[PDB]
């Protein structure tokens, strides 16, 4: 048996319950591109990867890259994700 989530899931509960654990992803935002921590290239806000930014704005899991995420073994917390954002844009 596993503990089941509440009727409504909110950021506070998930962050508090899993505090002290590594973040799922790290994203750096620049003037006209973004990248991941271990990524060497870059992605443009006009490229096909705009879906990730849209999901981040809407707070939804990006199902389109599910297999790519599974290949990297990204950690999931109660089916959700925790994402760290660095703002170099300003």
């Amino acid at each position: 048996t596993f503990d089941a989530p509440p009727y409504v899931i909110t950021p506070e509960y998930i962050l508090k319950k899993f505090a002290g654990h590594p973040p799922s992803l790290i994203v750096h935002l620049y003037q006209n591109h973004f990248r991941f921590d271990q990524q060497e290239g870059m992605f443009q806000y006009k490229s096909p990867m705009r879906i990730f930014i849209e999901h981040l704005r809407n707070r939804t899991v990006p199902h389109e890259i599910m297999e790519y995420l599974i290949q990297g073994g990204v950690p999931f917390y109660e089916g959700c994700l925790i994402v760290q954002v660095f703002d170099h844009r300003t």
């Binding site: 048996t1 596993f2 503990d3 319950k17 899993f18 950690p75 999931f76 917390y77 109660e78 089916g79």
Partner: peptide, 23 residues
């Protein structure tokens, strides 16, 4: 296996009418 992979931790008018209908 799937569940582990997802990080699942282990007012008065009403009464008046009713009284009339009972009477």
């Amino acid at each position: 296996d799937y569940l582990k992979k997802k990080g699942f931790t282990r007012k008065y008018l009403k009464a008046f009418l009713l009284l009339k209908n009972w009477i």
